[PDB]
Write a protein that binds this ligand. Structure first.
Ligand SMILES: CCCC[C@@H](N)[C@H](O)C(=O)N[C@@H](CO)C(=O)N[C@@H](CC(C)C)C(=O)OC
Ligand SMILES: [Co+2]
Ligand SMILES: [Co+2]
Ligand code: NA
Length: 263
């Protein structure tokens, strides 16, 4: 019950993933001590709207009030950009971007570490990305989604950290969230066998504490229950004939765009 994208389709995703990636590239200089999350959102949307000639998929999505999600430190996901929340030395910050261009969505996020790094967030953010990369390397036709989740979770826990269970990566294309669900863990519920032309995200959330999370009274903001740090990276990809292609790759990613398992 998963759409297989045509070559036209795939290329529209290329463009949409690139624009989403470039939002995250454009915003980096602004991710600085003193800056508010509200203005980062304004910058991102202005860019998406005026220069990208695109839309944010997030705005209005289940009533979501801003254009990107900005999650700071213990906030796991769906943190709401707010003119009064200021970035400070030490912070680890996720900005999650999704744009729609030409019928198609690109969906991506990364961690920024604000001003003077702290130490254990340096590590959480690193491990969380390494966990995304190891999943991206497994992706190829005929492998099962379940191996991928099981393999993320192993890595993450072996570090002292946990995988958040409530939120998962997702098929993506003309719909924001299409099949399949891409769990970052082993559940025997999961059985998807991958095939060229599927497009989906992988977006593990990792807590330096324990795996349990909590939603706030704004009905959006998810925090860790034990108030530890949590980190997330996300890429949108296409299954290729012999591996994958990352459609949201940034200049700062240290994994190649084209991952090929062929001889
Ligand atoms: C408004 C935000 C965000 C979307 C994305 N950039 C993120 O990659 C995502 O798709 N998140 C999903 C993955 O499970 C998600 O968090 N969806 C929520 C939907 C709410 C809008 C109700 C969910 O399914 O919670 C159980
Ligand atoms: Co996202
Ligand atoms: Co997503
Ligand atoms: Na966080």
């Amino acid at each position: 019950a998963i759409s297989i994208k045509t070559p036209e389709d795939i290329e529209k995703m290329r463009v949409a993933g690139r624009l989403a990636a470039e939002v995250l590239e454009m915003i980096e200089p602004y991710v600085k001590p003193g800056v508010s999350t509200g203005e980062l959102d304004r910058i991102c949307n202005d860019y998406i709207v005026n220069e990208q000639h695109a839309v944010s998929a997030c705005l209005g999505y289940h009533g979501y009030p801003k254009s990107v999600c900005i999650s700071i430190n213990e906030v796991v996901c769906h943190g709401i950009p707010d003119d009064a929340k200021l970035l400070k030395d030490g912070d680890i910050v996720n900005i999650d971007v999704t744009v729609i261009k030409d019928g198609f969505h690109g969906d991506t996020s990364k961690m920024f570490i604000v001003g003077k790094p702290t130490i254990m967030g340096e590590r959480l953010c690193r491990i969380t990305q390494e966990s995304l990369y190891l999943a991206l390397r497994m992706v190829k036709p005929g492998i099962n989604l379940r191996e991928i989740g099981a393999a993320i979770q192993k890595f993450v826990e072996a570090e002292g950290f946990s995988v958040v269970r409530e939120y998962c990566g997702h098929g993506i294309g003309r719909g924001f969230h299409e099949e399949p669900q891409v769990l970052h863990y082993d559940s025997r519920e999961t059985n998807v066998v991958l095939k060229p032309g599927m497009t989906f995200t992988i977006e593990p959330m990792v807590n330096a504490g324990k795996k349990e999370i909590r939603t706030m009274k704004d009905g959006w903001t998810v925090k860790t229950k034990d108030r530890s740090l949590s980190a997330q990276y996300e890429h949108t990809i296409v299954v290729t004939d012999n591996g994958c292609e990352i459609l949201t790759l940034r200049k700062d990613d240290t994994i190649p765009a084209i991952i090929s398992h062929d001889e």
